[PDB]
Write a protein that binds this ligand. Structure first.
Ligand SMILES: Nc1ncnc2c(CN3C[C@H](CSc4ccc(Cl)cc4)[C@@H](O)C3)c[nH]c12
Ligand SMILES: Nc1ncnc2c(CN3C[C@H](CSc4ccc(Cl)cc4)[C@@H](O)C3)c[nH]c12
Lengths: 234, 232
């Protein structure tokens, strides 16, 4: 009864469903961000709306950790699906996060690695196990594996090809997860990403996202709600 | 007046750090912040680490813990403008991400949703930096500086920057992140960096050779600019 779960979503649509469900809700406004505090089905939560891309996610995550000191972080939201069995609405769970757009290979760092960081950030094993238990209980289709982040909306063409080449094992792509993982790494806070597929990052991904962002928000929010309850009680 | 100063690499902050008197160190989130006085002016110097996220996390800690009135971003840069040589100064009038692309939804190339397409540096800070450049007889260019999470080393990476930002005068990896955090907190910023290489196919070798020259030139400029701002 003394756990506080931090949850981070980038777009307002990505946090609005959870935000609705928060009891005794209060809003903290700082640094261009909002954090909603209160309880989700009894469990104390702090839900950050970060805004879009790596710096917004990093600024937001840093305020959430400093102001709220959550025990763990769960990153919720939509994603572009890369793994072949994924369909719109399916869940993706991070094993690990990597930047697809960092390149200091001129000095022999690994592609995707920034100097001062590990080449990728591992998500927490217990959080991952708890997410997989929720996926089973909810009877959802999910893939676990590497999620890659960058400051680009992937829409086929080179951008997609470059990711498939550099990270053939990446299951999904998005724009905040890695930055949240990098902040959590620096503060020793366990994280997991539990997103849902809104598009498959190909030349029609903008139209698929226009159509399916809400479905992905709903599916990822349902998972996060289940996860929070499982973590809190088992 | 409290002046915030941010450099990414330890080599980019060390010279200033050696000069801070009444010095205390805050160690937090993988960053270090050194507080005290630089030639009688209160400063807070952040060593942020490398790239956009490190810079953003560190800038956010510095603004929260130290509440500086302004931010100056110091360090090295890849020179893009034709009149630039190694050691020369670049001063931002504006900062943009060269690697942000949400053009699929019709944002401007380099713009992230929720941000302006570029972040404008502070006119009073720019004017003070140009007075310092003239007094020290330096060669400098003022203009757009672009940031990304890549060390630019010629070939297609460089070509893409030149296509998208023909007006960019230099490239680096943190400034626009610092600008964005400053934007969100309504804190004025300026970038005053110096050229270690020209972001071409041999930029790694030039950086091997001239990082220290650039850290020195940018640090000496910063020290002069601090003095000018606080004391005229
Ligand atoms: N193909 C893809 N590529 C990168 N990220 C995503 C995402 C996940 N995010 C949703 C969102 C897409 S970019 C955008 C567009 C308009 C507006 Cl108002 C706000 C943001 C980013 O937060 C990352 C889903 N599919 C993606
Ligand atoms: N051609 C270029 N491209 C991008 N950034 C820079 C910069 C400015 N920075 C220095 C540094 C280059 S990457 C690097 C390599 C070794 C180690 Cl230990 C740590 C970092 C980044 O902070 C950005 C100078 N030239 C640049």
């Amino acid at each position: 009864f003394s756990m506080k779960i931090g949850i981070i979503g980038a777009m307002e649509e990505e946090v609005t469903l959870l935000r609705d469900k928060i009891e005794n809700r209060q809003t903290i406004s700082l640094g261009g961000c909002e954090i909603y505090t209160g309880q989700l089905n009894g469990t104390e939560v702090a839900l950050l709306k970060s805004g879009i891309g790596k710096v917004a996610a990093a600024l937001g995550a840093t305020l959430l950790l400093e102001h709220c000191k959550p025990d763990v972080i769960i990153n919720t939201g939509s994603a572009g699906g890369l793994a072949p069995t994924l369909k719109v609405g399916d869940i993706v769970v991070s094993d690990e996060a990597r930047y697809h757009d960092a390149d200091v290979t001129a000095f022999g760092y690994e592609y995707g690695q920034l100097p001062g960081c590990p080449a990728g950030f591992k998500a927490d094993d217990k959080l991952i196990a708890a997410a997989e238990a929720c996926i089973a209980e909810l009877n959802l289709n999910a893939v676990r594996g590497l999620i890659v982040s960058g400051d680009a909306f992937i829409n086929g063409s080179v951008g997609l090809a470059k990711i498939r080449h550099n990270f053939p094992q990446a299951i999904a792509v998005e724009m905040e997860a890695t930055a949240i993982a990098h902040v959590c790494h620096n503060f020793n806070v366990p994280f997991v990403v539990v997103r849902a597929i809104s598009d498959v990052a190909d030349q029609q991904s903008h139209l698929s996202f226009d159509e399916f962002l809400a479905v992905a928000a709903k599916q990822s929010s349902l998972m996060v709600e289940s996860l929070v309850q499982k973590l809190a009680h088992g």
